[PDB]
């Protein structure tokens, strides 16, 4: 069965839109699940003794919009109070209520498809024995898939994927590669090199395909406790070419950080 | 002419809201075009032989909200079935239908401003000769302009702009610069240096303005097949200063990767 909503009703009766249908629609438009909120303090909440007064705050919980207009929540002293918006559709006259709780008791209850009380924490209010010491809002999560953007400003941080690889390059050289965003690689040199000539391919493992650059990358390294240096080339095929001086039978400790981009312009 | 919707209609005749007007509003709020969807399986679809039963799935296509409640789609065996939502506004009683097709036949038809049937693929269901082997959803695209965000988590990748520049710095030295996000630069050294003294400005081309740093950047390089190194300074004014030892008539191959930031804290 297909149940249609955003469609015209020729005889004004065909497609009635329920509050739960709009709830689900709104959740989908904003990219919210039942474990987050949309919240806006149009005016600042006021703290008086062990109470928080929401003067003019709008909340969207489970795609349901409501307003807190001079709504006071009594708080527990010397405690971290978790402020919840609770939606119980069976309480027909007053389906929404606020509570101050000892823990984040957000339950992710699907109120738009089934029965149950939705509880969702939106504020954290810390108290002393006399009043509010600090308030921290709960994060409003936007769950999106693929984004096309022109400009972005981040005040906190962006967490991107990280992949790691250890390569036993041969001749005693060990590379520890860390790739972030599938593009930026930082190579950390370890081990001790011996029995190699300039221009020669190293005798060990080639770099795994996911860490191979599109163009040859020359990475400078240093010999620990010496004034001497070397460089290696990570070739697009994964091979590593030695470009330091010829090294004899005696191993020399190799260290240093070198960076490269995997991707070119496109 | 101006057509108003989210406004008071004193006589309940002025600003009635059409389904296409809400469709466009919803598309604008979520940042969707006609080539994507908003989709949520509130309960898991069920696979039975060559059929997919959508138990409780909500879809937004062209800003139009509808629900699939125990709606079964018959599948082609030993095939990759592309599941489509098809919207035909002329079919007033049943404007939405589902189809299983041999290709992604999404047509991007503007149903809110023009005529036509909107076809949009939302699921990919692969079958054997007897039933479903795998299911993959179609990506939900968010087309945005300028974003202000506190924190972000990326599970895939961020694609940022890339600019490249080759500089014939003089004395046989060649720099290949790759700039990403208009900030991070990785310099790759090439060529072979000769006839230069420490502290001397190199005899060739200065770095183009878009690659110039705010502060002097010292980039370490290596001499191929040797245990010797050098460094160059990329000055904010665009000039390059040699800071290796004095080089005679015989050129020595220069290689290595060095990174710098164009922008400081601002």
């Amino acid at each position, epitope marked *: 069965t297909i149940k249609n909503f955003t469609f015209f009703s020729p005889n004004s009766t065909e497609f009635p839109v329920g509050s739960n249908n709009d709830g689900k629609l709104y959740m989908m438009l904003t990219g919210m699940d039942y474990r987050t909120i949309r919240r806006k303090d149009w005016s600042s909440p006021l703290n008086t003794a062990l109470n928080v007064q929401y003067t003019n705050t709008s909340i969207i919980a489970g795609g349901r919009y409501f307003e807190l207009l001079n709504e006071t929540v009594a708080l527990k002293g010397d405690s971290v109070n978790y402020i919840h918006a609770n939606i119980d559709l069976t309480q027909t006259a007053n389906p929404v209520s606020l509570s101050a709780e000892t823990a984040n008791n957000s339950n992710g209850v699907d109120i738009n498809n089934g029965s149950g009380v939705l509880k969702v924490c939106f504020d954290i209010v810390t108290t002393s024995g006399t009043g509010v010491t600090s308030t921290k809002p709960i994060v409003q999560t936007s769950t999106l898939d693929s984004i096309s953007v022109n400009d972005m400003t981040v005040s906190g941080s962006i967490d991107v994927p990280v992949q790691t690889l250890t390569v036993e390059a041969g001749n005693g050289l060990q590379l520890q590669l860390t790739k972030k965003n599938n593009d930026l690689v930082i190579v950390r040199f370890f081990g001790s090199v011996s029995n190699i000539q300039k221009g020669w391919n190293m005798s060990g493992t080639w770099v795994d395909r996911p860490f191979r650059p599109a163009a040859v990358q020359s990475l400078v390294g240093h010999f620990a406790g010496r004034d001497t240096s070397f460089h290696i080339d990570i070739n697009p095929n994964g091979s590593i070419t030695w470009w330091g001086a010829n090294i004899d039978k005696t191993p020399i400790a190799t260290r240093g950080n070198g960076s490269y981009f995997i991707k070119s312009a496109w | 002419t101006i057509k108003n919707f989210t406004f008071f209609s004193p006589n309940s005749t002025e600003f009635p809201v059409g389904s296409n007007n809400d469709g466009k509003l919803y598309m604008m709020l979520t940042g969707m075009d006609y080539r994507t969807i908003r989709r949520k399986d509130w309960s898991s679809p069920l696979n039975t032989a060559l059929n997919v039963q959508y138990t409780n799935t909500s879809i937004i296509a062209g800003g139009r909200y509808f629900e699939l409640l125990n709606e079964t789609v018959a599948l082609k065996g030993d095939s990759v079935n592309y599941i489509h939502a098809n919207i035909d506004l002329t079919q007033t009683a049943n404007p939405v239908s589902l189809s299983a097709e041999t290709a992604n036949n999404s047509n991007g038809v503007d149903i809110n401003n023009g005529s036509g049937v909107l076809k949009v693929c939302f699921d990919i269901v692969t079958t054997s000769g007897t039933g479903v082997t795998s299911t993959k959803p179609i990506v939900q695209t968010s087309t945005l302009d300028s974003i202000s965000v506190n924190d972000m988590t990326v599970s895939g990748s961020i694609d940022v702009p890339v600019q490249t520049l080759t500089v014939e710095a003089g004395n046989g030295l060649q720099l290949q610069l790759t700039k990403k996000n208009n900030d991070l630069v990785i310099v790759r050294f090439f060529g072979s240096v000769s006839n230069i003294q420490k502290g001397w400005n190199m005899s060739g081309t200065w770095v183009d303005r878009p690659f110039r740093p705010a502060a002097v950047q010292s980039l370490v390089g290596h001499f191929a*097949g040797r245990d010797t190194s050098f460094h160059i300074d990329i000055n904010p004014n665009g000039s390059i200063t040699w800071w290796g030892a004095n080089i005679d008539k015989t050129p020595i191959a220069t290689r290595g990767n060095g990174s710098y930031f164009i922008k400081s804290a601002w």
Partner: nanobody
Amino acid sequence: VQLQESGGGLVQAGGSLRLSCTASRRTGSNWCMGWFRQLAGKEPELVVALNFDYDMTYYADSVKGRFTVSRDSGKNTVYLQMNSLKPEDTAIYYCAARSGGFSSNRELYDGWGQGTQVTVSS
């Protein structure tokens, strides 16, 4: 990939011979073109090679100061001009090409030649 050899033939001890080799394309960075040789029914050895990207040559101790590797400029062509040719150097010279620098391992070479025979009398 594909290689096109030239030169070879006979010459007396203390004489001179020239080898030519052209590669159809380059497989990548650290592009090396050289020759391998199998002397008196023994394992092959990388006699000579040239790193195009670095303009660095490699010569095995046995051929040092006699054999000279040159490149034909812009084209992917390598020449081997050998002087003071001795009867121990009587072997079949196989042209080799690869991306990733010099290597003793035959497998690691992307391009392998048919082989050009060099014969020198006592």
